[PDB]
Symmetry: C4
Subunit: 327 residues, 4 copies
């Protein structure tokens, strides 16, 4: 049976199995009014996890997220707000995981969010120019300063996450509680094989992103790049190329076969994809993305699909994908 709320890794932080992200949309692709409606729908449906980053829309995503929280007046204690730090400006010192940028970056993010603290502050990616000890000491400092409750990693290799733990235990600092990693039918290796090891060894939880591979898994690009789609937005040529790549067309081919299973289960492809991401209880929460209310409500409906993901169905999906990693 699905437990809607679960611990993020071994930490005491309880999050909904689904969260709502703000990449591309908040302060960018969608209006603040649409953003307000989406967050309200999420909150009213039990979602307590909202993710953002200092880099999203050059800080505007955080401003919008913060405005909604203040306008709606929801109790701060009922929300789990997370933000990621790494890209905070054009100046040399305004990027990275140095103590200087972690403190300056988080302080600026909190100011934009109109919050005293975030529940989890994440390193948006690894920093090849800053030693682990400095970063872990900085993360520990902002937590001790009450600017964050916990910290986590994103896009870090399992060895790098273990290195952070090593530094934390050697210098009696605070270890990370979660790794925010990409997870969907076409990106499974890290989450299915590596993360479970980190959970058992050092309690690291898995909060996944892009469950629909930026919308690709929806099947919407089955015949070209639809107008208004993310892949058609300015600054997202990389996504369009990926979709139009040889491999991208392959993916669409497999999606048609997966569509057959969805109809069979009585759900949509996106609902099948999102439910699939939560099938295994190694994933603490899946961060959703949505440009409108129809998509968000559809996505939230993935919860009803879970009970239907039998061993046979899963095996059938693995046969189609043909990318089941080795354990």
């Amino acid at each position: 049976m699905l437990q809607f709320y679960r611990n993020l890794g071994k930490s005491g932080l309880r999050v909904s199995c689904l969260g709502l992200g703000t990449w591309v949309t908040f302060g960018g692709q969608i209006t603040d009014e649409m953003a307000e409606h989406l967050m309200t729908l999420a909150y009213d449906n039990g979602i307590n996890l909202f993710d953002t980053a200092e880099v999203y829309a050059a800080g505007k995503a955080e401003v919008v997220l913060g405005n909604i929280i203040k306008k709606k007046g929801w109790r701060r204690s009922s929300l789990v707000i997370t933000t990621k730090i790494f890209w905070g400006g054009k100046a040399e010192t305004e990027r990275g995981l140095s103590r200087k940028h972690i403190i300056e970056g988080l302080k600026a993010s909190l100011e934009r969010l109109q919050l005293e603290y975030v529940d989890v502050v994440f390193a948006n990616r690894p920093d090849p120019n800053t030693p682990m000890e400095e970063t872990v000491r900085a993360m520990t400092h902002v937590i001790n300063q009450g600017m964050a409750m916990y910290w986590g990693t994103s896009r870090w290799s399992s060895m790098e996450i273990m290195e952070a733990y090593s530094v934390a235990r050697q210098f009696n600092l605070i270890p990370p509680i979660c790794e925010q990693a990409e997870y969907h039918m076409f990106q499974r290796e890290k989450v299915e094989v590596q993360l479970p090891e980190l959970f058992h060894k050092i309690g690291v939880g898995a909060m996944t992103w892009s469950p629909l591979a930026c919308g690709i898994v929806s099947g919407k690009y089955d015949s070209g790049i639809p107008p208004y789609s993310r892949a058609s937005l300015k600054g997202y040529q990389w996504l369009k190329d990926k979709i139009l790549s040889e491999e991208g067309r392959r993916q669409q081919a497999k999606l048609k076969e997966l569509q057959a299973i969805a109809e069979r289960l009585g759900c949509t492809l996106p609902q099948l994809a999102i439910a699939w991401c939560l099938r295994n209880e190694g994933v603490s929460s899946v961060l959703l993305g949505a440009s409108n209310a129809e998509q968000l409500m559809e996505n939230i409906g993935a919860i009803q699909v879970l009970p239907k993901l039998s061993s046979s169905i899963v095996h059938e999906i693995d046969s189609i994908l043909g990318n089941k990693p080795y354990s």
Copy 2:
């Protein structure tokens, strides 16, 4: 000879052998005017220990306690105020011993109390969803932040209290100074056998609660549930059932025999019961409960009974109760 003031465990915190609790009464069963009178009587009689919790009357108990302190103008340095954290709201993240709720919960409690800090912050019960290290780190954090002077446990098993100590010594954090445990003639095992071990091994003190078993030991329920009694209050059906249970009637049977001893000593059953709780010097303080001034003054009179609790009397009481635990 009885020493009215004593250290709470091995810590330097000095508390009166009797304290006044706020469960059921403050902000609930009794008026704020009655609450003011009761706290004033306690304070004027040397009591410096006052206990509350974020969950009592949904925060109203703390508001009332805080209003009295401010109105009476007693020096903060002359008071020992304690509050318990665990149930702070209906949202998923508003309960438990996670760092998030410990900080948010205590901050909200202090705001209601109109205090900068409590002397002891207690975990109201064990949290099966939060690792010990997180909880001990959080408790240590609020103490270092000046929101609490010390921390303690409540309703924790002796192994769990030792686990908190283990974590504290392994990561150089602050260990707990006290366990708030139930203690009365019908619940003796933990306080008489387990707590003494913790005192000698890790200095944990014992602050006990419900010395009259919610009023049962008073003998008032000898013939049914009296009107206005706690057991007749809305939301306390559990107490009524307990009193009307097979075991509950048994307890009343033994109380009649204990009543004979009380008359013999020239005191009331409640005074005998409370004095009994303080007979052994393993108990640092007993938290009293009272819905009116007659009960409180009667209860405080238990101090004069102590000198009379001879070895013979104690043995006689053990014979009647027949529940003397094994050491």
Copy 3:
């Protein structure tokens, strides 16, 4: 050659070899105007060390000391202000070295002093009811909170000071930098034998008090208790009895012989006594006491006596006193 300024123990805090205390006088025996003049004379003569305590004149000494500092406008960075904590009120919890009283006591002292911090906060005496770890953790906390730069002990045995060091090194806390001990011709054992060991082993410095044994060494009580003398003040019967005791008269007998040496050196008995206290370079600073400007200026003149304290003179003084401790 005498170095007027020296390190307090092995710490980096530099103090004048003479300091000015506030016991009995400030906010008590002398007017605030006299207090202002005395502190000004001290400061203008190079003294940068001023000592007080929460217990002196029930907090009034600190208020007077603070008023003078604010009125004169001396740079805070040019002063070394020390206060002692232990007796802060009539309530049970308003005394001792518990974390509660150390924090509440120092906070109240700083408020009275109108200062953000003291340079050294001292435990006024040992606390038999509070474990060392709690006290050292509390002292470390107020230093980390910026309420004090360093901490020290007073009236503690050399074993107790070593215990504080043990706790500090075991839990990585801050060790004490100084012990404020009584030192004069009739009380030499601890300072001459024990303190030097602590300096070499754990860097503890010696700041001494009552160099004239409350005025006894001045010879003023050679024929009874002079009017207006400290021994004649209300609340100082203990001093009068000490002076009028069999041992006290003995002391006066030896003082007459010491007076002969003083005349010979061309100085007064008090100057000889104070210079004697600084003869050995094991004493970092001697805290002076004075009820008027004549005494203070006389006392400060002890510095010119030092060059004259030859080995012969010292041996001659030891012969008269007959209390040279064993090394």
Copy 4:
């Protein structure tokens, strides 16, 4: 190829290979208007490193630097501001590396700078009267207090820097990230031989000063002390004597030969000297000094000289200097 921005030692702090210092000039030799122009030129040319000290012009240098930052409105996150502590006043306690002066000194510097924190706080020189542990604990404290991001040493021997590291690792404190050392054609030993060892062993970076030996390397003193030159300023007789010393004239002799190489490379002597200081990648940044815009722009032009410092050129320079240290 030259990387304009580089890590300061192994820390995550990224600095421009050239920085601008404020010694002698800011708040002293040059007007605030000239200072503003120089800092603006530096900033606009990519320099993000600005150095000062509490002792420069008795605090006026920091005031001027702070006024410029506030007036220009540059983002704090785009700047790396460093200040040095040691000489903060005439009083005994207003100098040194004691916890008292480190905290009071840095607090006063920040107030003058109108900044909440500096990126790096440096000990301006070693303190023979303060134990290393006290100093490292104090440096760690101001960093934890958010008054500085990191700390460093200046003018410390390689053994003393290693001692700071030893203390930091023994007591789990923060180690230094950089040593600010003198480096130019006539002072090479420490930077070329000792500092590289510290970089590899404990990650300490090298930020060098006086690349032109106070202007001597410019060749301007080839025929006496030019009017308005630093050596002619009041309070700099020491520099004049050094230039007019036997050794100083020698240096000028070698400068004439170096001038030949400069012309050959198509650059000025100062550009050759500064580029020389950056030839080796063991130096993280070179702090420039300038009394006017012509000098600063000339100095910044040293960057174009680097590509020209071939092995032959370097060897030729070593032959002339004849002071190549032994590795």
